Ligand binder design. Structure first.
Ligand SMILES: [Zn+2]
Ligand SMILES: [Zn+2]
Lengths: 42, 41
């Protein structure tokens, strides 16, 4: 039942949303991080 | 080569590949994540 974000290791119970990939996951928190990285801004 | 773990595109076919412990996500998939999270197109 436990699913984990592949980037930070948090479970679905720890984040607001966990997005599925083939055999991976990424949570809303890491997405925020990806946006800063792509947009090169804080 | 390194590939986005979500769409499968290589590091040669995308603008940026972000790395995790042993996973990657490209700029294109991140855009899809923003749509998913913001529930908007
Ligand atoms: Zn995460
Ligand atoms: Zn991708």
């Amino acid at each position: 039942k436990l699913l984990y974000c592949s980037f930070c290791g948090k479970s679905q119970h720890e984040v607001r949303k966990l997005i599925a990939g083939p055999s991976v996951y990424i949570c809303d928190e890491c997405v925020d991080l990806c946006n800063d990285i792509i947009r090169e801004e804080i």
